[PDB]
Design a protein around this ligand. Structure first.
Ligand SMILES: O=C1Cc2ccc(Br)cc2N1
Ligand SMILES: [Cl-]
Length: 130
């Protein structure tokens, strides 16, 4: 229905706005672009599903997210991948892990404040109907 297509357009507007606000934060710069496989060829041999904020933006636009739960699965991957690939005690690794955790915490706090639970419930009921 046009009502349902209006619902998903509003979801995509909301997801673009959250993602833009994560992407412009100086702490999250390293998560805005894919890991360069030339300059880091080991990444793909040890991380199963790479994710970054530029790939989240592409997926919003290709209509890959039909719920906020689906979007948060990708934000969680950005964080868990950073923790996996940079596990050591050196300051370079500790700083990346601190910034990865702050990304996930910031995304969850925006959504907690700004997402209406009835709007997410409607997205879920339309998704389960298809
Ligand atoms: O589920 C797993 C664990 C894992 C880590 C990394 C890569 Br690449 C593939 C897999 N398979
Ligand atoms: Cl820096």
């Amino acid at each position: 229905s046009m009502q349902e297509e209006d619902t998903f357009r509003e979801l995509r507007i909301f997801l673009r706005n959250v993602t833009h606000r994560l992407a412009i934060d100086k702490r999250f710069r390293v998560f805005t672009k894919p890991v360069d496989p030339d300059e880091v060829p080991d990444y793909v041999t040890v991380i199963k599903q790479p994710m970054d904020l530029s790939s989240v933006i592409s997926k919003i636009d290709l209509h890959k997210y039909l719920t906020v739960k689906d979007y948060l699965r990708d934000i969680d991957l950005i964080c868990s991948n950073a923790l996996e690939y940079n596990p050591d005690r050196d300051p370079g690794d500790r700083l990346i892990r601190h910034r990865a955790c702050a990304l996930r915490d910031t995304a969850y706090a925006i959504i907690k404040e700004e997402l209406d639970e009835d709007f997410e419930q409607l997205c879920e009921e339309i998704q389960e109907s298809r």
